[PDB]
Write a structure and sequence with these properties.
Elements (H helix, E strand, L loop, with lengths): L6 E6 L4 E4 L9 H8 L16 E4 L5 H11 L5 E2 L5 E4 L5 H12 L11 E8 L6 E4 L6 E10 L3 E7 L4 E7 L4 E4 L1 H5 L2 E4 L7 E10 L4
């Protein structure tokens, strides 16, 4: 753990702020996150922070929508990625248009006007011990908003801030959408630890370019 002596926060999806907690650590179990995530509303705002650009929307997809998408996903072949992951590189998929619209309908200001260069499905699997390390995309090549939709199972998106030694867990439930922009995009690195994966999960990624080139 690089985050062993970090200050750990939990994201309150209702108040849309990160509360510090002593009940979590850098090696917290997936259950610990969920219990703290649902119990942090009554906790004090003392020491809390606001992470501008972090947008979690519960139940972004319905079960019909998800089922339709998952069936279309599995027709296409899976490539090999790193750290026990697989991928499908796309823009091309028919279900992209739908997702872009729903994103605009919920919020035209933030999630509208979105033309991503890449749309990528990232398959996780508990048995492979799939994961993605803490990292950040360069602002000179990659743009503002990073979308991620939780298919099959939810998980936890771990955020870090090295300059301030802040660790933050965002519980992403089944069929939730996480948009990462602004501060969250540019001042925080993001990752998903192996012990936060429940069975199989497919993260439906999107990302826009910084420039047309």
């Amino acid at each position: 753990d690089k985050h062993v002596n970090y200050k750990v926060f939990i994201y309150d999806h209702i108040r849309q702020i990160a509360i510090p907690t002593t009940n979590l650590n850098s090696q917290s179990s997936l259950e610990d996150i969920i219990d703290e995530s649902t119990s942090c509303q009554s906790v004090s705002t003392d020491g809390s922070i606001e992470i501008d650009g972090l947008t979690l929307i519960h139940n972004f997809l319905s079960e019909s929508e998800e089922s339709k998408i998952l069936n279309m996903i599995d027709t296409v072949e899976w490539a090999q990625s790193q750290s026990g992951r697989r991928k499908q590189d796309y823009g091309m998929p028919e279900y992209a248009d739908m997702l872009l619209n729903k994103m605009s309908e919920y919020d035209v200001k933030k999630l509208g006007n979105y033309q991503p260069f890449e749309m990528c499905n990232l398959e996780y699997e508990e048995v492979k011990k799939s994961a993605i390390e803490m990292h950040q995309d360069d602002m000179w090549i990659w743009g503002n908003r990073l979308i991620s939709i939780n298919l099959i199972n939810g998980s936890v998106m771990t955020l870090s801030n090295d300059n301030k030694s802040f660790l933050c867990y965002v519980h992403m439930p089944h069929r939730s959408l996480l948009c990462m922009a602004d501060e969250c995009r540019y001042d925080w690195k993001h990752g998903v630890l192996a012990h936060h994966i429940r069975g199989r999960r497919i993260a439906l990624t999107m990302r826009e370019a910084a420039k047309d080139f």
